DNA sequence: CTGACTTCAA
DNA sequence: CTGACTTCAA
DNA sequence: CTGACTTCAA
């Protein structure tokens, strides 16, 4: 029947209590969604050549990394993506999880569409001319679910199109869009370079070995959901590995048995002393030297390790920043080579509401990591048998520039990861992160994914998608390439819960913990002020830290 | 979806017991709201002319404060004269010595929700269409996690006319925030400096909830009906009489 | 006059209330609340603060 | 001597939207949190000030 | 046949090619939406995106 | 997964785009003044991050 | 001898044990020098306060 | 003739509550009292100076 | 009424 | 289909 | 009378 809901809205973030200190969350969340007709009802192939010889084109000297020339094959549909931590979680929430918890796994996932609604637009008058709105109590809106995976996997946390993270706000899904193979190649160039310096900037031809286009009508079953109907997708169960909500900081230099001090400090203010290094215990792999020290004892492994940076492969796909693990900045604030994110997103992700021009709000993530981090400029290598101290030929130190270019040190070109290497998980970012991710389908995979906490082991959650039924009009000719169509568009809720299983924190030190909390302090980025709403309204949701509390190592 | 009732019921239990059953029926409207937003809005009434907490002996003038408007209305009937007819009220004052609560359900039904559109252009009149797919929301906060705001106190409860229509109450609730007022007569020195201040919101008292995070709600379309179920009070009686 | 009231959750509770007869020893009768969920027009854009609405209004008993 | 007390406790509801004040730790020099206060001395000297207790807010009506 | 480039979601285009034998356009990339691991500049491409892993590697030779 | 070896650089960070001569090393210059022997050479970029796929049958040998 | 630098200071990164070669290359095989006292193998009638030194190099030869 | 025991445990019953139990544990001296007797003393401030309660004003002290 | 690229976590 | 600040007067 | 940071490899 068209006069009867077929779903009920629900946003609670229920904790259960199951005892031995393990919860059960489960995180509820509805949205009203709006969904209007596609600007094409054809599927594209569809080229981004962004070679000018201007501004940021790839065909100015040294501008490579401005690459954005890809192929894409456009679809008619769209992707409703609820894959962000904003769209589960009341900040106080991740604030409670983070405090009190100690680690936290996915457990399952199960999402609704209701209460559809189809309308189509008409025009009024003349003078003026008005919009009147009606229903189309027989039109429809179809969905399917890839529950298998045949189609790319587009996470749309990654270009800040999941669902808006405001239970009170409307929000709309994001138009599917998926990569197709274009051979690429562009040639590399400083702003040195020559005057008369051809610059190579290609596109090629589709290739019969690597061309795959896929439609959803061919590869899913397809439910038409006119306003009395309703979709659910049934239980997912997630099969992936528990996240600590703790941090480390324990670096080289803190792991094992401290050096013995000779006699306890004279006073508070004083310091204490080893024994001489020469008759000091200990082991070291340096054997030309016949002492031990801080720096030169052996440790059990490595914590952290150098990446190279900012390193950029080139592929057929064309030039391509590698990825980088997210660890500890350090004091000296290397940023780009311990990975730090900088994400950039729009106000139904966090930016506040009042916030005006194009421009969307940025942000830099610095790994909570404490222990795992690299202070690039204070590293260095020494040759061996061994020299200390070494003289300007003995060592390789930040000062030494590579091939005579005056900004490229050997740490730029550095990888120092190897069977000794140990570090941490990347941090779950709320509320704009992403929270699940589909493993590469390779025979050899990566130890972990820099964009998401949680890589499914299995088969991940298939996408939903959506789209309007085409609505045609009395003049319809196949022969012909005209298209009339009525103006119509729709709307519908949709509704999903996640459950998590998470175990509270034990409590064993002394001295009280760090937390996060809240603030009255005038422009403190913790100040409540910014987690509640304005005179009109205005609301805006910046990041909040995670894993406050650390832990031992070792 | 349902039925209309107003009467009000004795049942004579014997021993002198009395089962009185309050049926009240209203026809209630429900516009858009002004706005979608949950707004923390401040009132600062601090004018140094007229009624303004700024001139002299004006602390009992004192309107400031800050409340979370929501865009939600509140269906209030907590008031004797949604209740009783007037003539209800005297029998029950003449002839009883005790009263006291007993139940309380309550429900909602026949639903109609309709859009407005514009006509002709000389004249422009208004026309009224169905939207018969349209739906109003409904919550109840059966655990009392928000914020009680009694109707009655500000004579804002449904009408007490069972032939009249009434409307809820838009909903919105106080927020914590500094304020402070000096005190002075109107005989003050005429140099005096009067504090009034406001201040901004404090980590240690801020408490900002929305309906849609800590309550399930029901989607009602023009065939659906909500009801409550039973309610059971536990309060103490009542003395009719006076001393 | 209003008839039942909710009480003041504190330690210590006043003896009785000013504004009702009826003060609850236990939780009392939840709220209930209403509102009219969004209709919206075509022209709807989440990353942008224009609001179009259709103009709407309910009645119910 | 040895004692054993026995409490019961129960945790904490969380509804707001806007984040909780915490009693928290920290590292700025002078602070009254600041952690130094709870760690030992050189030689070994404690000192235990008085904590916050009862950080978050609870409605009272 | 997917390298770090073919990974996940496209960037979104402003419109589809007005003929077939158009290009499209991006929105300016210093009002995209999207991450990198550069902090230093503000703006997202392509190339800069950070993706979820590396695809293949760099051998000596 | 392969490598454009002549197509691979590595800039200094902060990042700048464009980089100078000095910001970036690419396939053009010499390692140890050796006119041939170029940063990619001893270049190792293999990680936690790396994904690969597995080596072909070769039909028949 | 790779020096690496974290906010604990710089450290020397460890090296995986393995054979030295003809060439004698202890530290980029991470050959382990320990030093120790007399309840764990010096001589008791070593005098000083010098602990004895010795370095292991890897059986392994491969 | 006993085990010393100064751990704080934490019990999660479920539903929320939780069973703390606190241990506390220290070693005691006790010496000699300074008599054997049960003694009615008096202390009785009343000097004419100082913080004594014959000083005008002093009845706090 | 999600299961690893179809049906078919039947 | 009201139960004391979630689920859960289950 | 060792069990992964408490109790609690109960
Ligand atoms: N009393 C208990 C004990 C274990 N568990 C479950 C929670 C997890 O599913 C599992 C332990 O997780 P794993 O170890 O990270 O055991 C529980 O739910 N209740
Ligand atoms: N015959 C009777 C006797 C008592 N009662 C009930 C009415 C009240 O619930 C209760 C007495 O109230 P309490 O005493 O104020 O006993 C009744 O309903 N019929
Ligand atoms: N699952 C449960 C439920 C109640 N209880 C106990 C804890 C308290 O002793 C009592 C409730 O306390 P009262 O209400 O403040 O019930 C429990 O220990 N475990
Ligand atoms: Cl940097
Ligand atoms: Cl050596
Ligand atoms: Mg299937
Ligand atoms: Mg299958
Ligand atoms: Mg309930
Ligand atoms: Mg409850
Ligand atoms: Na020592
Ligand atoms: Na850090
Ligand atoms: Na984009
Ligand atoms: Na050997």
Same mark, same amino acid.
């Given at each position: 029947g068209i006069g009867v809901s077929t779903g009920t809205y629900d946003n609670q973030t229920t904790y259960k209590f199951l005892g031995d200190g393990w919860v059960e969350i489960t995180a509820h969340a509805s949205r009203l969604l709006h969904l209007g007709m596609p600007p094409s009802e054809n599927y594209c192939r569809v080229t981004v050549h962004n070679n000018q010889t201007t501004g940021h084109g790839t065909k100015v000297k040294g501008n490579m990394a401005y690459d954005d020339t890809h192929q894409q094959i456009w679809t008619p549909?769209?992707?409703? /993506?609820?894959?962000?931590?904003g769209v589960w979680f009341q900040p106080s929430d991740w604030q409670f999880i983070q405090n009190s918890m100690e680690s936290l796994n996915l457990d399952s996932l199960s999402q609704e569409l209701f209460n559809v609604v189809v309308k189509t637009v008409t025009?009024?008058?003349?003078?003026?001319?008005?919009k009147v709105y009606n229903n189309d109590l027989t039109a429809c809106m179809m969905v399917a679910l890839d529950s298998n995976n045949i189609l790319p996997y587009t996470p749309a946390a990654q270009t800040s199109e999941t669902l808006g993270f405001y239970p009170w706000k409307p929000t709309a899904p994001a138009p599917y869009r998926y990569y197709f193979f274009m051979p690429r190649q562009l040639s590399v160039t400083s702003s040195?370079?020559?005057?008369?310096?051809?610059?190579?900037?290609?596109?090629?031809?589709?290739?019969?070995?690597?061309?795959?286009?896929?439609?959803?009508?061919?590869?899913?079953?397809?439910?038409?959901?006119?306003?009395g109907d309703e979709f659910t997708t049934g239980t997912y169960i997630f099969n992936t590995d528990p996240l600590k909500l703790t941090h480390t900081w324990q670096t080289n230099?803190?792991?094992?048995?401290?050096?013995?001090?000779?006699?306890?400090?004279?006073? /508070?203010?004083?310091?204490?002393?080893?024994?001489?290094?020469?008759?000091?215990?200990?082991?070291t792999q340096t054997q030309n030297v016949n002492y031990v020290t801080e720096a030169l004892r052996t440790r059990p492994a490595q914590i952290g390790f150098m990446q190279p940076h900012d390193n950029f492969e080139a592929n057929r796909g064309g030039p391509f920043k590698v990825p980088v693990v997210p660890l500890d900045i350090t004091a000296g604030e290397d940023h780009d080579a311990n990975g730090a994110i900088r994400f950039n997103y729009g106000k139904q992700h966090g930016e506040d509401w009042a916030k005006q021009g194009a421009a969307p709000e940025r942000y830099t993530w610095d790994a909570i990591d404490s222990?795992?981090?690299? /202070?690039?400029?204070?590293?260095?290598?020494?040759?061996?048998?061994?020299?200390?101290?070494?003289?300007?030929?003995?060592?390789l130190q930040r000062e030494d520039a590579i091939a005579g270019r005056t900004n490229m040190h050997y740490t730029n070109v550095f990888n120092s990861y190897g069977p000794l290497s140990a570090f941490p998980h990347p941090d779950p970012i709320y509320p704009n992160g992403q929270i699940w991710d589909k493993e590469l389908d390779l025979e050899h995979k990566?130890?972990?994914?820099?964009?998401?906490?949680?890589?499914?082991?299995?088969?991940?959650?298939?996408?939903?998608?959506?789209?309007?039924?085409?609505?045609?009009?009395?003049?319809?000719?196949?022969?012909?390439?005209?298209?009339?169509?009525?103006?119509?568009?729709?709307?519908?809720?949709?509704?999903?819960?996640?459950?998590?299983?998470?175990?509270?924190?034990?409590?064993?030190?002394?001295?009280?913990?760090?937390?996060?909390?809240?603030d009255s302090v005038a422009n403190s980025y913790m100040n409540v002020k910014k987690w509640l709403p304005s005179a009109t309204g205005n609301m805006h949701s910046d990041p909040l830290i995670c894993r406050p509390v650390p832990h031992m190592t070792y």
């Open positions: 549909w769209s992707l409703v /993506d609820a894959n962000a931590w025009e009024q008058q003349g003078a003026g001319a008005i040195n370079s020559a005057e008369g310096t051809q610059i190579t900037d290609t596109i090629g031809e589709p290739q019969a070995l690597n061309s795959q286009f896929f439609t959803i009508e061919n590869t899913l079953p397809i439910t038409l959901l006119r306003t230099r803190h792991l094992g048995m401290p050096p013995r001090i000779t006699d306890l400090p004279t006073s /508070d203010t004083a310091t204490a002393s080893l024994t001489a290094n020469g008759d000091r215990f200990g082991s222990a795992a981090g690299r /202070d690039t400029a204070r590293c260095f290598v020494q040759s061996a048998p061994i020299s200390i101290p070494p003289n300007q030929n003995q060592i990566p130890r972990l994914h820099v964009t998401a906490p949680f890589v499914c082991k299995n088969n991940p959650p298939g996408q939903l998608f959506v789209r309007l039924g085409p609505n045609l009009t009395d003049q319809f000719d196949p022969n012909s390439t005209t298209v009339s169509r009525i103006v119509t568009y729709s709307t519908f809720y949709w509704k999903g819960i996640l459950k998590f299983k998470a175990k509270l924190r034990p409590n064993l030190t002394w001295n009280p913990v760090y937390q996060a909390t809240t």
